[PDB]
Each structure stands twice: as C-alpha cells, then as structure tokens.
Amino acid sequence: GSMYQLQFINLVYDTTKLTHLEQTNINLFIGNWSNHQLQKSICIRHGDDTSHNQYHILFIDTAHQRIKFSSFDNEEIIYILDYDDTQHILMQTSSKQGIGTSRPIVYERLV
Ligand SMILES: [Cl-]
Numbered sequence: 179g180s181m182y183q184l185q186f187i188n189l190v191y192d193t194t195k196l197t198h199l200e201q202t203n204i205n206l207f208i209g210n211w212s213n214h215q216l217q218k219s220i221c222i223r224h225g226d227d228t229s230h231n232q233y234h235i236l237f238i239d240t241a242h243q244r245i246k247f248s249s250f251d252n253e254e255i256i257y258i259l260d261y262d263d264t265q266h267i268l269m270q271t272s273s274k275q276g277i278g279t280s281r282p283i284v285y286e287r288l289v
Pocket residue numbers: 179
C-alpha cells in the first residue's frame with residue numbers, strides 16, 4: 179500500500195509544573211496515530227527546548243479530556259485534540275483571531 183506522510187508534534191512543557199491530573203491528560207495523546215483518508219500519521223511526544231517540530235500547549239482541559247496547542251512557528255493556528263479512548267483521539271483546528279472551529283477528524287492509534 180501507499181506510504182503516509184508523518185508529522186511530528188513535540189509538545190514542549192515542564193512536567194514538574196503540572197498537576198498529576200494535567201500530566202494524565204497530556205498522556206492520553208502521546209503516541210503514534212493515523213488517519214486513512216488523509217494518508218497522514220502524527221507522532222505526539224513530549225519534547226524539549228532542543229527539539230524540532232515544537233508545539234506549545236495553550237490549555238489542558240481536565241474536565242473534558244482535551245488539549246489545545248499551537249506550533250512554535252505560528253501562534254494563530256490552534257490545534258485541539260479530544261480524547262475518545264485509548265485507541266482514538268480527534269483533531270480539530272481553530273484559531274486565535276479567526277472565525278470558527280473545524281469538525282473533529284478521528285485519528286486511530288497505530289497498534
Ligand atoms: Cl496493500
């Protein structure tokens with residue numbers, strides 16, 4: 179079959195400043211995920227100041243199991259990840275000063 183494109187998302191954050199539940203919630207999204215229709219995979223990991231593909235977390239929603247983040251290189255585009263279960267998360271796109279938020283797209287964990 180076809181090869182996919184793989185995008186790295188290295189979330190940059192100091193764990194020692196978070197609550198246990200905020201850590202839990204980020205951890206729901208760490209992993210390797212794919213969407214068949216886009217032929218796209220994302221690899222979400224905790225990175226650091228040295229990393230490439232750096233993203234900054236804007237909000238950790240422990241009420242609804244979501245995180246919001248933006249790339250270091252563009253503060254305007256906001257990504258939202260919604261937890262479903264251990265094998266499924268959903269991505270939406272919003273923005274700092276635009277109108278609207280996109281419909282969720284399911285990413286499945288690569289067994
Ligand atoms: Cl095949």
